[PDB]
């Protein structure tokens, strides 16, 4: 029960016969998972957490880097990956579902492995992740610093399917989402108008919504999604909303989070991304590593 750092290992449901790339990297370097769920619930116990300084994020990063590197020296469908604590250490799991990833958490649990997380490299929006339970969440190291990213957890899933390109979003689901987000931002930012506008500039992956499907890279136009005013009340001003994807040479998935950036009478937020570690921070906000005392 002492906070520390140590090398972790991965658990896979990998099958040796499958030639899918996530399998072949996992078969070699991920040990078989444990059927026993394991659990150790605690309560009225407080531990400080900081999702923005967690070495667990860096460890998944270097694995996926090596995964992609050795994979692309065709199949490509990720596997949910479990990251597990070694002997002498454990993983603390904060349980306040209203937790924002920083400060004290009064409800913890003890696990030796993580929940299944498949690695999905993307920008602007987080896909196939873990939905936030109950309320929608807002996470940043410093909201005062415009440069620091803002991760928004989705408590209601929106299905997204793009085929060989265009993308499909139900307007009813999306307009629900933005109204809440701006309302949460209205709590975090006073009196200020709160607009959503597309990426001002940068690389193609950041300016579009980029993702990989079955091995082919898709970059989708986001000017249609980020186009609203959402002040007192709500209002979206764009043309089911459809986005334009560029193939470079279908996927049934659901969005689970947002990535935003603020410019510094109105406060405007734009889609972002790039550091795939923040994609990993979306699924690792709960876990911390401690040394058994």
């Amino acid at each position, epitope marked *: 029960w002492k906070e520390a750092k140590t090398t972790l290992f991965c658990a896979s449901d990998a099958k040796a016969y499958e030639k899918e790339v996530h399998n072949v990297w996992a078969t070699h370097a991920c040990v078989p998972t444990d059927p026993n769920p394991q659990e150790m619930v605690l309560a009225n116990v407080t531990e400080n957490f900081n999702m923005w300084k967690n070495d667990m994020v*860096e460890q998944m990063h270097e694995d996926i*880097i*090596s995964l992609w*590197d050795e994979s692309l020296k065709v199949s490509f469908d990720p596997i949910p990956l479990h990251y597990c604590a070694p002997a002498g250490f454990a993983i603390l799991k904060c349980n306040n579902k209203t937790f924002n990833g920083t400060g004290p958490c009064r409800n913890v649990s003890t696990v030796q492995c993580t929940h299944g997380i498949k690695p999905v490299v*993307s920008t602007q929006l987080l896909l196939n992740g873990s939905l936030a339970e109950e309320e929608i969440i807002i996470r940043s190291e410093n909201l005062t610093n415009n440069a620091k990213t803002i991760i928004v957890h989705l408590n209601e899933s929106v299905n997204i399917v793009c085929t060989r390109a265009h993308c499909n979003i139900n307007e009813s689901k999306w307009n629900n989402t933005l109204q809440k987000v701006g309302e949460e931002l209205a709590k975090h930012f006073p009196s200020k108008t709160i607009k959503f506008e597309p990426s001002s500039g940068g*690389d*193609l992956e950041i300016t579009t919504h980029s993702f990989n499907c079955r091995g082919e890279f898709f*970059y989708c136009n986001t000017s249609d999604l980020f186009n609203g005013t959402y002040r007192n009340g709500t209002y979206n001003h764009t043309g089911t909303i459809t986005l334009q994807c560029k193939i470079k040479q279908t996927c049934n998935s659901n969005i689970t989070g947002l990535l935003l950036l603020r410019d510094g009478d109105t406060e405007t937020f734009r889609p972002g991304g790039g550091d795939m570690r923040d994609n990993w921070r979306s699924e690792l906000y709960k876990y911390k590593v401690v040394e058994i005392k």
Partner: nanobody
Framework: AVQLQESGGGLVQAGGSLRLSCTASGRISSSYDMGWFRQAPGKEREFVAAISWSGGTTDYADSVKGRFAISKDNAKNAVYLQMNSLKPEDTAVYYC????????????????????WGQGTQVTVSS
């Protein structure tokens, strides 16, 4: 991830030249960009140069185009910045950086927010 260490900084007379080097620990995979940044006294950090790890395509800040050259040696996991015709406005701490871009569409390197960072090497250009 990649651990970076810069070298080569120091004092140089106006008009002189200096070559900076940066080597990582840890293998650099095919989708990385490597770049150089600098921070002058009391000023914000700015882009200097970048190079694509696999393709070798370069980009230079307008302030340094012609005067600096970025190069690489993949076998050594090293990147270099040859600085010629140095001027007092180049006095700064120079940082080497890496940016993993697995979803890049082209080989052209970025000039935006790099995510992995070295400790810096100081370059002082005397008037």
């Amino acid at each position: 991830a990649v651990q970076l260490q810069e070298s080569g900084g120091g004092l140089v007379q106006a008009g002189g030249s200096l070559r900076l080097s940066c080597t990582a620990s840890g293998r650099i995979s095919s989708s990385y960009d490597m770049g150089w940044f600098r921070q002058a006294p009391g000023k914000e950090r700015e882009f200097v140069a970048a190079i694509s790890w696999s393709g070798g395509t370069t980009d230079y800040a307008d302030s340094v185009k012609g005067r600096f050259a970025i190069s690489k040696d993949n076998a050594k996991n090293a990147v270099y910045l040859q600085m010629n015709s140095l001027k007092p406005e180049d006095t700064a701490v120079y940082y080497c950086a890496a940016k993993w871009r697995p979803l890049r569409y082209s080989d052209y390197p970025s000039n935006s927010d790099y995510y992995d960072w070295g400790q810096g090497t100081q370059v002082t250009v005397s008037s």
